[PDB]
Amino acid sequence: INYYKDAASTSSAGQSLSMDPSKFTEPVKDLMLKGAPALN
Amino acid sequence: INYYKDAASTSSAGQSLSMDPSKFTEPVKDLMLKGAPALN
Amino acid sequence: TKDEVNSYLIPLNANRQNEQVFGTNLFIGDGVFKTTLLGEIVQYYTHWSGSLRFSLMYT
Amino acid sequence: TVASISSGPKHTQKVPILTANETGATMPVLPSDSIETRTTYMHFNGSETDVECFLGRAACVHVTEIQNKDATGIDNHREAKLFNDWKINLSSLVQLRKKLELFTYVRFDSEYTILATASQPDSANYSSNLVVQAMYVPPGAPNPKEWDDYTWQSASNPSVFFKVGDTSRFSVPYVGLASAYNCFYDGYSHDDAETQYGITVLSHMGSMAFRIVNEHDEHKTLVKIRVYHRAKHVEAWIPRAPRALPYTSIGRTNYPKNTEPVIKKRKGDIKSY
Amino acid sequence: TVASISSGPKHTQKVPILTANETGATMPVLPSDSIETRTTYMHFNGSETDVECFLGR
Amino acid sequence: PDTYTSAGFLSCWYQTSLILPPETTGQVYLLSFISACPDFKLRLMKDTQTISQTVALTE
Amino acid sequence: GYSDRVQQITLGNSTITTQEAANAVVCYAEWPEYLPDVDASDVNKTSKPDTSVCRFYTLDSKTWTTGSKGWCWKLPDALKDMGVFGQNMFFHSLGRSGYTVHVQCNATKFHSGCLLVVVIPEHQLASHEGGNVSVKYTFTHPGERGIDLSSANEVGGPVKDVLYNMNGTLLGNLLIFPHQFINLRTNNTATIVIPYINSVPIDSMTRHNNVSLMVIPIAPLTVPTGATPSLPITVTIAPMCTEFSGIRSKSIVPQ
Amino acid sequence: GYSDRVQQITLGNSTITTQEAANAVVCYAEWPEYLPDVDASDVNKTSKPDTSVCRFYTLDSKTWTTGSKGWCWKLPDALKDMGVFGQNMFFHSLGRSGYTVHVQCNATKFHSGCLLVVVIPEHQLASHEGGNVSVKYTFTHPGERGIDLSSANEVGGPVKDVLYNMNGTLLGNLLIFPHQFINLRTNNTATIVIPYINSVPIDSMTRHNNVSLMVIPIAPLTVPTGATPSLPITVTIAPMCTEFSGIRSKSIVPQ
């Protein structure tokens, strides 16, 4: 129950439960498959 | 009504109403019947 | 003895046989690990569990 | 539920009262196996003997004390009780301890209540309301050194601020590293020849640290902190023999030497009533 | 969720542990790519490492 | 770092040995990285020993 | 014609027969079983030597005399040197096991005496010094010899006072632990099956013992007239469902 | 992008990667497998330690120099002391095993040299004395050290003449045995998978070795100018599908 009118006044947000490290761990242009050779 | 998000914050648990003394009072391998001889 | 780019480099000697290249314990919150991003984040938490990936790139 | 059924005379070849205790069992014998009984009902459930109930009331687990005074020229705040800490543990005060050690492994959430009362020993004037800060300092966190260190910023560490005379209350989930807390541990932290033996090695749950936020007034004020602990959501495994001798140390089973006989000697014979 | 799957001996032409770090990627290698593992579950969600939680006290 | 809770050691040795081509000399180096597997769990947040201060900063 | 009385236990390449048993106890009514995945944490596949480790090792014999106070063995310690069980133990980082314990003591229908055979999960001993003196490692790792409660206090060792179970509790209440009596007049053996009991799924076999087996004379031995005044007591123990994990170099332990 | 050239073998808790392989040989085109019942004789259930024995042990390294004649190891001897493999070995009456052998030797594109890596089932050695002099036990059980064909004749030892394979046959014909070459210009490792080969279903691991692994320089090592004149050769071997049976007291063997 929100007792207040504005959105800033609500409690903390709830877990992204998004999670996708590939923008950080695999930003390569041509896709690399694990097990296939790195450099062909 | 829980007012809080986490489970630790809820009140005391409610009675097991489990109760089974046999693990402590009769841990024998071959079942003993009351009234039958203890050692055959 | 002072922080240098050189403490990132593990040296290798030609022609040695049987010998040891480096050693370290695995206290990820201390010692070599401590300034790494992993080490640095682990330090915001009290407990850790899981597998670590250690890789070596040859130059 | 019947507490006793009706049972009459018996002249059998089936004797429920003769057993062999060498087997390790406690055979479930009842009044009606050996006298003539009448029906009676239980009228009772055994509610208040549930382990949740047994371990579920607040017990005092710790009394400490800190003072508000001018820290000017104090070389060791910790030592002046300018702030103090507590190496969290539940085995220091021994009423709650005997209760928990009826079990080998125990798992529960904790609810802490902290009461703080003030005392002014040296004849005084106006007492300005002191606000206590309790902050949890887990293992591997910058321990605080003065009563007003950067540590107290506590940007990542849960801390509660309440007023002396009031009470603070909050609840911490089961923070054990394993599946249960060991009430006992017959091991070492590693196979060294001189490393400590017990649980103390197992139960290093960090310390809790208290301080007054207020600067000093003209008089000195003693604040004494009492921490109460209530187990909620209790789970207990493997019952053990109750503690008979007195305790000597947090975390070891050791009893004092030249202790006194714990079994009351008869005033009379074996035959005496 | 499985934290580790069961995996046994390997004698392949397909080597997941050799990579080229010069590429800028961190290849997602797991214990089961280089030792024999048994199944285990995570039992954990990563709740308390959410940025809302990290900056939220 | 804690004993009961300790994780092991990591070492590295020559299996055969480094061999340099002709016209080449000296030490070669390995770079080493660390990251966590997807396996990893961290819990119970706390304050880092990696940063402290003695007076508030100003502009 | 089956009696509670006669029994045969075959485990591995070894068999035990008793013609005068008094049933058998299975701790907490649970039988040893391997470690399920749902309970697993370490990702390593475990090693299950099976029949080469799950057989019966008979420890060296003790001698019950009228002055005996009782003996205490710790597990897996007592077996630290038995065959391949022991090797596996020193060579893996972690291991887990249940056991069948068979304690033997026969006499004649003129003797009297009664031993308590009990298994105590997590038996943390007390220092006889009091205060917060610790009990050094070696002292709680007697090996097959076990601890002799009628031996003298030593320094860094545990207290050996029987009315207190070596920990501040009374002998009389040990009966809350899985146990069985050997009453010369009834019984000649005691058998207890121990499931693996710990707060972690698998542990170190050298830094932590998870049960102490204790044999304590309670009704003193009384031999017939002009009989030799003593009887030997033998303990035979078999690891069951053993699993080892995290193999490597081979632990080096104090002393 | 799979090449015959790069390979990974993971066995137990140990992994090997080669980026310059030349395929791998599987003796007689058969892969190690356990002992089927139809072939069994001993009635004992066997013990299969699995991952604790089926991992890779790297023996101590050798040094190929221009004067090297070749080295010879016997199996299971070479592993008689490796971890739990070895313990099992001394502790059971009978055992059986296949192996993965990985021989390693890297150089540069200026070196030349070529080693023959061959596995000989039942390699009965000859006495250098001639006549019917025997080859004493110790001499055919060198352990991880193996036999160094350029060492001197010793008394009671085997002959170490390379053009004769240590038995009266010519080096040139060793190619009828499963083998692989390491030619610095091509190759940097050799890998052979050995199935268990015997005339009995299971045998003693100490009185009979069932294969000798032999590494022999054939085209002499030639290093680039002013290079150090030698290269190390390393042998790593992993028991696979090992089974032990007839556990007991623990063999005592000469020397």
Ligand SMILES: Cc1cc(CCCCCOc2ccc(C3=NCCO3)cc2)on1
């Ligand atoms: C056995 C056994 C069980 C316990 C109790 C463990 C409790 C976990 C840690 O306790 C606390 C205490 C205080 C705080 C706290 N946070 C802000 C103020 O106080 C947090 C956790 O101790 N030994």
